[PDB]
């Protein structure tokens, strides 16, 4: 059944302006195929746990042998939640199907149809849509800009301040200490997404709030477990009662099925293995810094302060050229383009993980050095 | 950390207006704990595949095989060598040109609506269609136009009045267990230049040739633009899929927010689904059984005078307001029958439902007990029905 025009028209225009314009007839995010020799910097599995023998074993053993609301009794709630909460220092933790759902769910629970939400420009898209589904009043503030933040709160009233601890496209770090002060001052709740800091930062990997000593000041913490925990799930920690209600309020929690008990048993192993990876955290940290210093001396804006490094490659055409160069030279990042970015501010993201060599770090810098000189594109 | 008042007070009111009011202090969906003797009817595992050894084997087997640290958006894995053979197998299984994998039924629906919709777009949706279809629409800012449950007349007038658009339905509705009038809707879709989208979550695998679904049973597959399913029912797995008889699946992976900004299924989950597909392809036995048992239950209850709108393995007990619903639940659980409470936001506060979901492991003896308990319930119990 051929499509009606109202759909077909849209689909053609999309196909035209998003696939056809690229030199390979594909979406900008899709490039070449990588070799076993090439350097891949795409995964969010920062501590390189995706193959971990123990973790796999725990899962197989547990799988050998509906909705989440009907499982909110004391006897129905998994040990993994008590361990994560303890781990993080927060009072309660609630499992979700994903980081995305965790954000969406928390926000729908705690928000009302005009609630002030003060969200960093670069906060994960799920926080945005979170506030949007709840029909909250979104108040964007310039990246990590507390002055802008103050203005807007002063202007619009108390509400919920929303940030990534470590930003997904840029590797920047939120001014958590100052944001904690700001929410105290203006009687606001603070929601922090530690997707990119949890496991990689803090004491035993417990995260940045843990590292900065700010856990006790923060109302809410969320995270995807599809980064360091290398698992398709989410979690919401509360220093309050909200978690008793989220399972009955959040749509994703109500009308969408939950993880099974073996999935939750697999996380417990991951947690242990994470707590002890002081080795991998330190090495990764070393590597990120090495890479960060090396790209900066080249002239590239490198805002990152973490294991996520953003090569700012301007507009789509330029971004394609940059990507092709990087890939032809054995370096594979991930293109971030609209709607994650704006059309004219794409990023090629380099995700570092604990498996990366000093040798591989020197190659990335080198390849970028030569890129800088080549002259087929520019960097911002 | 003292929550702001505009939060502390939302929670404090909810806790009381939803938890406190119930006899057990718990939410209305939470009854007592079930014993082994009790007849549990809450699962969506219609063919009883959850603890299947062959499925467990392949999941575990492929899980143990190797890492591919593919913790990233599914957008990044859309090259044809990157796309799982389960999609191609599912496509062929249902007869659609293209299948695409999603992290859940909910996402399948949201993602697809985001992709085909413009803010102006007309969306003719069944009053009782799954929430994920309403929210998808609402998220795309589309022009939603609800029509009365399974009413082709009401639907015609809407399209008549508002123009071409997307017709959205469940094949089998998840609360009432009713079956949409698919043949007619197809025709209406043609009689007005609309697109058809059917959510077969509750018919896929339980229905049609080899469980290929309801569209396939009726020979409609070629006439329909779109089908979606939760794979968390008969397929018993946390994932969803989108089927297109067109090129829309080329674009979903890049426009759907869920599909872009949330992590993809691991390749070992794909491998797992494959075994399940085979099992289901082969489960004619478990189907026929379920079908017959559902029919016994439906007749059994209808003869009791109860409204039994269902025509499937989902039976809707209509139990009115929350108080009265609370009494019906306790009574059904007091005897060994659970029992799946549907209430706001799923239903109107006044039209709550206690859903009985049958599966292939249910036996004649058990039905009778169910009928016996509701008969006594009608009847003897201090509460009403609709």
Swiss-Prot record, chain B:
Q: Which InterPro entries match?
A: Aminotransferase_I/II_large, AON_synthase_class-II, PyrdxlP-dep_Trfase, PyrdxlP-dep_Trfase_major, PyrdxlP-dep_Trfase_small
Q: Name one GO molecular function term.
A: 8-amino-7-oxononanoate synthase activity
Which cofactors does it use? pyridoxal 5'-phosphate
Entry's EC annotation: 2.3.-.-
N6-(pyridoxal phosphate)lysine occurs at 233
Q: Which UniProt keywords apply?
A: Acyltransferase, Aminotransferase, Pyridoxal phosphate, Transferase
**GO annotation terms (biological process):** biotin biosynthetic process
- NCBIfam families in UniProt: PRK07179.1
What family does the database annotate? Answer: Belongs to the class-II pyridoxal-phosphate-dependent aminotransferase family.
Q: What is this protein's function per UniProt? A: Required for the synthesis of the quorum-sensing autoinducer CAI-1 ((S)-3-hydroxytridecan-4-one) which probably functions as an intragenus signal.
Protein's name in the database: CAI-1 autoinducer synthase
> Which organism is this protein's natural source?
Vibrio cholerae serotype O1 (strain ATCC 39315 / El Tor Inaba N16961)
The uppermost taxa in this organism's lineage are: Bacteria, Pseudomonadati, Pseudomonadota, Gammaproteobacteria, Vibrionales
């Amino acid at each position: 059944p051929q499509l009606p025009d109202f759909i077909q028209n849209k689909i053609d225009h999309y196909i035209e302006n998003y696939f056809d314009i690229n030199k390979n007839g594909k979406h900008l995010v899709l490039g070449k195929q990588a070799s076993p020799d090439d350097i891949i910097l795409q995964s969010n599995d920062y501590l390189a746990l995706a193959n971990h023998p123990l973790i796999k074993a725990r899962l197989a053993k547990s799988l050998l042998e509906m909705s989440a609301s009907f499982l909110q009794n004391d006897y129905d709630k998994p040990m993994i939640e008590k361990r994560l909460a303890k781990f993080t220092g927060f009072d309660e933790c609630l499992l979700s199907q994903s980081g995305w759902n965790a954000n969406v769910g928390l926000l729908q629970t705690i928000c009302q149809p005009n609630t002030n939400v003060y969200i960093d420009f670069f906060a994960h898209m799920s926080l945005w849509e979170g506030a949007r589904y709840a029909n909250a009043q979104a108040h964007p503030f310039m990246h990590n800009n507390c002055d802008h933040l103050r203005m807007l709160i002063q202007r619009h009233g108390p509400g919920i301040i929303v940030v990534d601890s470590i930003y997904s496209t840029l590797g920047t770090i939120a001014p958590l200490a100052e944001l904690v002060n700001i929410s105290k001052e203006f009687g606001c709740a603070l929601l922090v997404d530690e997707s990119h800091s949890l496991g990689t930062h803090g004491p035993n990997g417990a995260g940045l709030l843990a590292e900065l000593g700010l856990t006790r000041e923060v109302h809410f913490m969320t995270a995807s477990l599809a980064k360091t925990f290398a698992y398709r799930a989410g979690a919401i920690w509360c220093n309050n009662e909200v978690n008793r209600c989220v399972p009955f309020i959040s749509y994703p929690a109500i009308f969408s099925s939950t993880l099974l008990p073996y999935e939750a048993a697999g996380l417990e192993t991951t947690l242990e293995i994470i707590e002890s990876a002081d080795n991998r955290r330190q090495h990764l940290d070393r590597m990120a810094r090495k890479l960060r210093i090396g790209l900066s001396q080249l002239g590239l804006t490198i805002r990152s302060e973490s294991q996520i490094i953003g090569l700012e490659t301007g507009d789509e055409r330029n971004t394609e050229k940059v990507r092709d160069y990087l890939e032809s030279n054995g370096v594979f990042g991930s293109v971030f383009c609209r709607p994650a970015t704006s059309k004219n501010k794409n990023i090629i993201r380099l995700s570092l993980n604990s498996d990366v060599n000093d040798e591989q770090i020197a190659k990335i810098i080198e390849v970028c050095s030569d890129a800088v000189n080549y002259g087929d594109f520019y960097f911002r």
